[PDB]
Amino acid sequence: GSSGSSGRVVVIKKGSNGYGFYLRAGPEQKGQIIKDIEPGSPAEAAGLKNNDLVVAVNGKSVEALDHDGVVEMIRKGGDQTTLLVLDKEAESIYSLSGPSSG
């Protein structure tokens, strides 16, 4: 079973206003976080989800790339592209720095 379980597979196809999902540089964790999902968009109709951490794109390791890197791969998929996000362990813990003040 080449493809494991830890990580769902999404599928989208460029429609009108692009795909319907943005990306941002997440914390230490590897991968890109999704957000600002557009309604009735190929991204929302695909099964995406806000705060979705992507580790691979079209069977490629992007968790090692940067905003541009990952975002680039997508532009390569052409019309449609597959996304690999984690569900069981998607949330990311935030460090604790900066004690009360003023």
Curated annotation (Swiss-Prot):
Residues 9-89 form the PDZ domain. It comes from Mus musculus (Mouse). The PDZ 2 and 3 domains seem to be involved in the interaction with SLC26A3. Interaction with the C-terminus of CFTR could be mediated through independent binding of PDZ 1, 3 and 4 domains. Interacts with PDZK1IP1 and ABCC2. Binds to the C-terminal region of SLC26A3. Interacts (via C-terminal PDZ domain) with SLC26A6 (via C-terminal domain). Interacts (via C-terminal PDZ domain) with SLC9A3 (via C-terminal domain). Component of a complex, composed of PDZK1, SYNGAP1, KLHL17 and NMDA receptors. Interacts (via PDZ1 domain) directly with KLHL17; the interaction is important for integrity of actin cytoskeleton structures in neurons. Forms a heterodimeric complex with NHERF1. Interacts with AKAP2, BCR, CFTR, SLCO1A1, SLC22A12, SLC22A4, SLC22A5, SLC26A6, NHERF2 and SLC17A1. Changing Y19A: Disrupts interaction of the third PDZ domain with SCARB1. Abolishes interaction with SCARB1. The gene is Pdzk1. This is Na(+)/H(+) exchange regulatory cofactor NHE-RF3. It is found in: Membrane; Cell membrane. Belongs to the NHER family. Expressed in kidney, liver, small intestine. brain, lung, and testis (at protein level).
